Amino acid sequence: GPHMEDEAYFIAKEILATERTYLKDLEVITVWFRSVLIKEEAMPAALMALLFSNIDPVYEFHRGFLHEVEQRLALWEGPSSAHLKGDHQRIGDILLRNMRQLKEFTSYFQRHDEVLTELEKATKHCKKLEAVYKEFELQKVCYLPLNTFLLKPVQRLVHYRLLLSRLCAHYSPGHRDYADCHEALKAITEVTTELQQSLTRLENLQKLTELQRDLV
Amino acid sequence: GPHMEDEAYFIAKEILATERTYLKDLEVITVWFRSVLIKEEAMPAALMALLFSNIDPVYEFHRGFLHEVEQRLALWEGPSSAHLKGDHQRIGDILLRNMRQLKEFTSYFQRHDEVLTELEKATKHCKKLEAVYKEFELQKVCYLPLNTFLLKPVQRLVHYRLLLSRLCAHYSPGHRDYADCHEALKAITEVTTELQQSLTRLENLQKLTELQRDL
Amino acid sequence: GPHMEDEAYFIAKEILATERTYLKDLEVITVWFRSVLIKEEAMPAALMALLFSNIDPVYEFHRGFLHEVEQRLALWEGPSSAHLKGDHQRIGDILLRNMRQLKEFTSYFQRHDEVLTELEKATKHCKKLEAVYKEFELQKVCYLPLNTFLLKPVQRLVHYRLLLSRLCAHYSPGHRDYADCHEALKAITEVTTELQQSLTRLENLQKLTELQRDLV
Amino acid sequence: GPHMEDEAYFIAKEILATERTYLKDLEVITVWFRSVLIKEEAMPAALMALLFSNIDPVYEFHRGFLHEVEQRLALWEGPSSAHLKGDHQRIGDILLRNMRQLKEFTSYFQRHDEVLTELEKATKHCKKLEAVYKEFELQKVCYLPLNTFLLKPVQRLVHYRLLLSRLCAHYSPGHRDYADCHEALKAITEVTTELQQSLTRLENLQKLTELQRDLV
Amino acid sequence: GPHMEDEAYFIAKEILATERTYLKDLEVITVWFRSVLIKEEAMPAALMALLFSNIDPVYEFHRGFLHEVEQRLALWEGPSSAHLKGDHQRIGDILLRNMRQLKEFTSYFQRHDEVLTELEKATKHCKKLEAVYKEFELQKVCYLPLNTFLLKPVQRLVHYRLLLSRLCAHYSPGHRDYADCHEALKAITEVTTELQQSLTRLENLQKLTELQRDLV
Amino acid sequence: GPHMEDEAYFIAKEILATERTYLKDLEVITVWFRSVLIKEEAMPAALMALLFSNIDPVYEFHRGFLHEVEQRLALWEGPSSAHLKGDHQRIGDILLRNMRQLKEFTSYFQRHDEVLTELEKATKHCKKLEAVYKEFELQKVCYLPLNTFLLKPVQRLVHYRLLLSRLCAHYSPGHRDYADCHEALKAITEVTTELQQSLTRLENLQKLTELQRDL
């Protein structure tokens, strides 16, 4: 069982829970929207490829990251032993491994600003596709405008930086989990830095289409 | 939309997400367990009452709290008229309301110690229980000994305190939400302290059996 | 309605009318320029961040302000039940609320002279961004040189100090609106004082530009 | 551009912004009301003549004025060759020309209180014209009671006297704009003085209406 | 031959010359526009009837009025005799006769505001007719927008009042032409008065469609 | 559009219309007569020169003047941006320009007396002329003895004076057009006075033959 002054436990709880919701969000694209693009064939196969090819492996990656965290957390709050209660009540080893793995996926995240760009390009010139968009954006699943979900990935990586930061603040240099978390932070940071151009470009694309619907 | 150096947005996301998982945790009792408990009738009707009586109302408060928060984070994350961005990119008001109305529920939590105690003494001097229990505890839904899902409700309250306090620390006094969050923190802190007694007895009851199984 | 020789009503109306215009002026940057900048991929992410990160929030502020001022002026201008006549026929409560709010935005205004120097620098050292400027400035929408729109936000704050001065000078201490207006003037004066350095820096910058643009 | 703390620039801009709005307010009568009045054949020719014969020319005047003020403000706000800087950065010549012109329009303003009483009279004694009013006042366009738009023209003239007062008070006798502004103030003051009777008649009329509209 | 201080001669010259141009204007409708409505069949036969049936007899009337004036004027400047130089150098007898005749035609003039109304109604709901209008309004013959010519008749009658007025001012009560001109004035006046409702309605219809194309 | 209590609009219409008829009057000489004069060659080439030489330039000035006025009345009568109504609903500027440049034509008018005199003495001691004349004077186009169309040019100048003076009287000094019209009036008045001598001799020459035919 966990101790109730252990901020680390709660940060892990937070990482896990915010990962589940992140993944449910990606499903708004990878499952539900796709279900609809397939029924309608409104999106050219090439552009469809462009979208799904740079989300699907991202989703697959997280699902594995989630699984490792879920497993650890259930040993953490579960009845542990003596020798095991040390390895069970930590999370930096897992975070370090997946933040490192992440460095391989930057390729896809970097493209999300093009994906959005091409989606908006095609969506303008094709009334049939626009129709499908309006229609899907009415479904309870699509709680934000669809193209807004395209920012959720890059934003998730920012959240990681945040979460790791708080971990490195809580742990003291003596701790069995300090070293791993500090390297983890370094890795997520390198990645957030590398995707800054793309995050800014994405952020600005979203502001523009929102602002343009709201002229004073 | 949501600002990235804006911690408050993330704490709000964190509040929302951990709320979702917490209700799932509850449903392990209020749904999948209740289901199995009728299909067996392996529990007294007055012991079954004593469980789902100090739990179901709590589930109902959280179901309500979850709705309000989810509804808001969606306004925050989504597009809005510019004159409205201030009203959506905040959460203190909702927290404070639900933290105040939480005190009207402390009664049920105080009785969690008994709920465990009287329940443990049940599965012990009973055969149909120890049998059904052992099998429920092998299902995917039950990732911890289901006895220990009874600590979850009071554990959650602790998380609120810790969460709200980070919020209060993020906001400069001139921000709109500073006022509300500070009151909300004061509120839940009052709740947790009243409940510190019940928390310890729960933690103790868990540690107790965790050792009777380790011999 | 308002009494026809009421100076407080006129200042209120002057605040409103001038707010609406200043907003449309911001839209030259926030919407129309940004549209072109994105379509042409002409600006480095970091510079685009510097610019819009310190304008976007300013625009949100003025939009909330305009919204409140507009409601009130219509209540003032329209028929009011006797018991609401005094509350509808004033502006100071709103000014005070917004002048206080503005304090939470000084950070952005403070970066404007920096945003400005960085733009010129980028334009001087990039034949393509320069071209995009030149072309944008030929659009009917951009009726002044783009960069001179960047001097408007801080100039608007000075205007506020001026307008509140007139109100404060107009009201006698007996009045419903006296205290709120004096409070508001104190607030905006605090803001302009904190921005004094940045203000004169922006003055000097424009004067150097219009002077350099025009040599014998 | 303008110097950022230039009070003359602010008054000029206040004149412009408030002129644009007042014009849109006149359009409620000249265009939108008139549209409905014609479609519904609700007003006797003679009354329709009384109304529009004394508004139509007023609108033409303000339109010419706005046109001149707009040109000038953009020249003021924009980059100017040194030799034109002084001519572009003033407003008094324009004010003086238009305040003089206004004298040729006092006849119309003078009939407004009469236009007003005659409308109310007609409305009281005609269930159909009354209905057309009631319905028009429900349109988003008519954001005040229609008749209260009729108090705006003479109120605008008072505003002019106010604005010129501030300019005159601001400029020192050395200034390029001093003489023209003082001349203009003299002109508008002549006009407001001649309309004094009609002004207070219009004040009294509104006060009686808003008071009668609202009895315990 | 005429005497060069005889203002009556010149007024007659003016009546004649302004009648010729009036008639050329009516031909813009009765000949040229009709030529085009017949080639295109864009206007329903009923509405065509409505237009031409209330112009054609008006035109026929003037043509006869013109003829009498033309004849008189050519005797006036022509070599007259002794007994004839008195009857030849006057015009009130002719003016009196035709202003009286005019009283019979008020029936048609009164309808011109309906004609215009119905033209605008049909022209909105029928793209084919609108097309023809745009097209015709490019021809050198159609120097004003076509529906503006529908005001020319009623305006011509006003001009008559003017012209007769000046005649009655010039002639002294002793003159062989005073009596006739004074009665003539009375008759044209009765008619102008009778068509006031329609003139106002026409005038206001024209203002509206012009103003609506020119919103500030 | 054009205002109805606005006299100026009407005087401008009157100016335009009477200008149209006056040019028609001229064309009775410069078109239909010139046509007949070639088809007969019944006039000296140096007498034909003397006519169309002191006339054609005048026709050319009026053709020009007519264009300017017509162009303007059309702006006046037609729709316009509101800020432009002041510039269209006026005519003094055009009048003044054409009244000034009229003085550079007074030369030709002074010679109208001779044009008639030398022309009358032509048709008198000639047979081919008196013959062609008599027949032209029976055509529809020639509603007055064509000799007397030579008074028309100077008569027109008088009309201008009378017309412009009504304008000056209509306008209050604060109207835009007051200035221009007042100068234009001063201008044509100068012209007419210089020409009063030539007018009288023309009128006299007409009255003279009008009596030789009445015996």
mmCIF file of C-alpha atoms in Angstrom, chain A residues 1-4 6-7 9-11 13-14 16-21 24-25 73-75 77-81 143-145 148 152 155 158-159 161-163 166 199 203 206-207 210-211 214, chain B residues 1-4 7 9-10 13-14 16-18 20-21 24-25 73-74 77-83 85 143-145 148 152 154-156 158-159 161-163 166 199 203 206 210 213-214:
data_model
loop_
_atom_site.group_PDB
_atom_site.id
_atom_site.type_symbol
_atom_site.label_atom_id
_atom_site.label_comp_id
_atom_site.label_asym_id
_atom_site.label_seq_id
_atom_site.Cartn_x
_atom_site.Cartn_y
_atom_site.Cartn_z
ATOM 1 C CA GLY A 1 0.000 0.000 0.000
ATOM 2 C CA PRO A 2 0.999 3.642 -0.652
ATOM 3 C CA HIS A 3 1.873 6.255 1.994
ATOM 4 C CA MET A 4 -0.334 9.392 1.893
ATOM 5 C CA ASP A 6 4.278 10.457 -0.912
ATOM 6 C CA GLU A 7 3.844 13.090 -3.612
ATOM 7 C CA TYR A 9 2.685 8.185 -5.689
ATOM 8 C CA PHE A 10 0.225 10.934 -6.630
ATOM 9 C CA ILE A 11 2.302 12.195 -9.559
ATOM 10 C CA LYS A 13 -1.368 8.363 -10.287
ATOM 11 C CA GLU A 14 -1.635 11.598 -12.281
ATOM 12 C CA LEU A 16 -1.431 7.230 -15.459
ATOM 13 C CA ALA A 17 -4.831 8.898 -15.327
ATOM 14 C CA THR A 18 -3.916 11.658 -17.781
ATOM 15 C CA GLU A 19 -2.487 9.072 -20.133
ATOM 16 C CA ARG A 20 -5.759 7.163 -20.242
ATOM 17 C CA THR A 21 -7.636 10.345 -21.182
ATOM 18 C CA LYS A 24 -9.271 8.260 -25.369
ATOM 19 C CA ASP A 25 -8.714 11.596 -27.120
ATOM 20 C CA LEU A 73 0.938 1.401 -10.155
ATOM 21 C CA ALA A 74 -0.998 -1.765 -9.353
ATOM 22 C CA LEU A 75 2.047 -3.220 -7.599
ATOM 23 C CA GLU A 77 -0.886 0.106 -4.182
ATOM 24 C CA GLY A 78 -0.976 -3.658 -4.015
ATOM 25 C CA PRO A 79 0.426 -5.703 -1.135
ATOM 26 C CA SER A 80 4.195 -5.685 -1.697
ATOM 27 C CA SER A 81 6.953 -7.704 -0.013
ATOM 28 C CA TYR A 143 -16.184 17.299 -27.801
ATOM 29 C CA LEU A 144 -13.769 19.715 -29.474
ATOM 30 C CA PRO A 145 -13.503 20.612 -33.147
ATOM 31 C CA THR A 148 -8.066 20.656 -32.455
ATOM 32 C CA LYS A 152 -3.212 16.932 -28.264
ATOM 33 C CA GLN A 155 0.726 19.036 -25.874
ATOM 34 C CA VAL A 158 4.645 19.147 -22.691
ATOM 35 C CA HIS A 159 2.626 17.693 -19.880
ATOM 36 C CA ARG A 161 7.965 17.738 -18.994
ATOM 37 C CA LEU A 162 5.747 19.272 -16.319
ATOM 38 C CA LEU A 163 5.120 15.984 -14.553
ATOM 39 C CA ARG A 166 7.560 17.979 -10.243
ATOM 40 C CA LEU A 199 4.005 23.183 -31.558
ATOM 41 C CA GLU A 203 -0.812 26.583 -31.936
ATOM 42 C CA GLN A 206 -5.635 26.839 -34.293
ATOM 43 C CA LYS A 207 -5.687 30.502 -33.095
ATOM 44 C CA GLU A 210 -10.761 30.410 -34.174
ATOM 45 C CA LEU A 211 -10.086 34.140 -34.358
ATOM 46 C CA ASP A 214 -14.786 35.898 -34.234
ATOM 47 C CA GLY B 1 -7.400 27.601 -26.249
ATOM 48 C CA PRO B 2 -5.247 26.214 -23.359
ATOM 49 C CA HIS B 3 -1.934 27.946 -22.493
ATOM 50 C CA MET B 4 1.210 25.799 -22.082
ATOM 51 C CA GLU B 7 0.026 25.220 -14.943
ATOM 52 C CA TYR B 9 -4.854 24.184 -17.047
ATOM 53 C CA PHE B 10 -2.839 21.064 -16.329
ATOM 54 C CA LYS B 13 -6.732 18.267 -16.485
ATOM 55 C CA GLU B 14 -5.127 16.253 -13.702
ATOM 56 C CA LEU B 16 -10.493 15.646 -14.300
ATOM 57 C CA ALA B 17 -8.478 12.569 -15.349
ATOM 58 C CA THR B 18 -7.865 11.222 -11.838
ATOM 59 C CA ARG B 20 -12.401 9.453 -14.070
ATOM 60 C CA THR B 21 -10.107 6.682 -12.809
ATOM 61 C CA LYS B 24 -13.870 3.417 -12.182
ATOM 62 C CA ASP B 25 -12.292 2.241 -8.930
ATOM 63 C CA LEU B 73 -12.426 21.579 -19.277
ATOM 64 C CA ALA B 74 -14.206 21.248 -22.594
ATOM 65 C CA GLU B 77 -9.918 23.493 -24.350
ATOM 66 C CA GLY B 78 -12.408 24.566 -26.994
ATOM 67 C CA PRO B 79 -13.036 27.687 -29.029
ATOM 68 C CA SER B 80 -14.908 30.585 -27.492
ATOM 69 C CA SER B 81 -15.701 34.218 -27.953
ATOM 70 C CA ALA B 82 -12.789 36.318 -26.756
ATOM 71 C CA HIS B 83 -14.802 38.114 -24.099
ATOM 72 C CA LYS B 85 -12.002 33.259 -22.407
ATOM 73 C CA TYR B 143 -6.631 -5.355 -9.696
ATOM 74 C CA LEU B 144 -6.278 -5.000 -5.913
ATOM 75 C CA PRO B 145 -7.844 -7.162 -3.192
ATOM 76 C CA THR B 148 -8.778 -2.360 -0.215
ATOM 77 C CA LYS B 152 -9.949 4.605 -2.188
ATOM 78 C CA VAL B 154 -10.759 8.641 1.642
ATOM 79 C CA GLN B 155 -7.514 8.478 -0.350
ATOM 80 C CA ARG B 156 -9.239 10.546 -3.038
ATOM 81 C CA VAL B 158 -6.340 13.553 0.246
ATOM 82 C CA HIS B 159 -5.568 13.920 -3.436
ATOM 83 C CA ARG B 161 -6.216 18.682 -0.901
ATOM 84 C CA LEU B 162 -2.832 18.119 -2.481
ATOM 85 C CA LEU B 163 -4.239 19.128 -5.871
ATOM 86 C CA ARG B 166 -0.883 23.330 -5.984
ATOM 87 C CA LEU B 199 -8.036 7.340 7.316
ATOM 88 C CA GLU B 203 -4.771 2.148 6.514
ATOM 89 C CA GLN B 206 -5.285 -2.874 5.425
ATOM 90 C CA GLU B 210 -1.664 -7.746 4.432
ATOM 91 C CA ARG B 213 -1.506 -13.339 4.488
ATOM 92 C CA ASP B 214 2.304 -13.020 4.660
#
